[PDB]
Design a protein around this motif. Structure first.
Motif, PDB file in Angstrom:
ATOM      1  N   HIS A  17       0.838  -1.174   0.000  1.00  0.00           N
ATOM      2  CA  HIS A  17       0.000   0.000   0.000  1.00  0.00           C
ATOM      3  C   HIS A  17       0.882   1.235   0.000  1.00  0.00           C
ATOM      4  N   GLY A  18       1.925   1.205   0.822  1.00  0.00           N
ATOM      5  CA  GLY A  18       2.852   2.325   0.910  1.00  0.00           C
ATOM      6  C   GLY A  18       3.472   2.615  -0.446  1.00  0.00           C
ATOM      7  N   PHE A  19       3.771   1.557  -1.193  1.00  0.00           N
ATOM      8  CA  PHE A  19       4.363   1.717  -2.516  1.00  0.00           C
ATOM      9  C   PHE A  19       3.480   2.621  -3.356  1.00  0.00           C
ATOM     10  N   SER A  20       2.179   2.380  -3.276  1.00  0.00           N
ATOM     11  CA  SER A  20       1.209   3.184  -4.010  1.00  0.00           C
ATOM     12  C   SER A  20       1.375   4.643  -3.623  1.00  0.00           C
ATOM     13  N   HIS A  21       1.494   4.873  -2.320  1.00  0.00           N
ATOM     14  CA  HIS A  21       1.681   6.221  -1.803  1.00  0.00           C
ATOM     15  C   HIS A  21       2.917   6.832  -2.437  1.00  0.00           C
ATOM     16  N   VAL A  22       3.995   6.057  -2.457  1.00  0.00           N
ATOM     17  CA  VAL A  22       5.244   6.512  -3.052  1.00  0.00           C
ATOM     18  C   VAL A  22       5.061   6.680  -4.558  1.00  0.00           C
TER      19      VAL A  22
END
Length: 23
Positions: A17-22
């Motif tokens: 999910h964090g990757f998406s944020h990044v």
């Protein structure tokens, strides 16, 4: 209960999910 398992996947998911944020 599931909550224990919940944090397990949630940690991993947080990256995915964090990757998406990044991204």
């Amino acid at each position: 209960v599931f909550q224990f398992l919940g944090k397990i996947i949630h940690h991993v998911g947080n990256f995915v999910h964090g990757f998406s944020h990044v991204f």
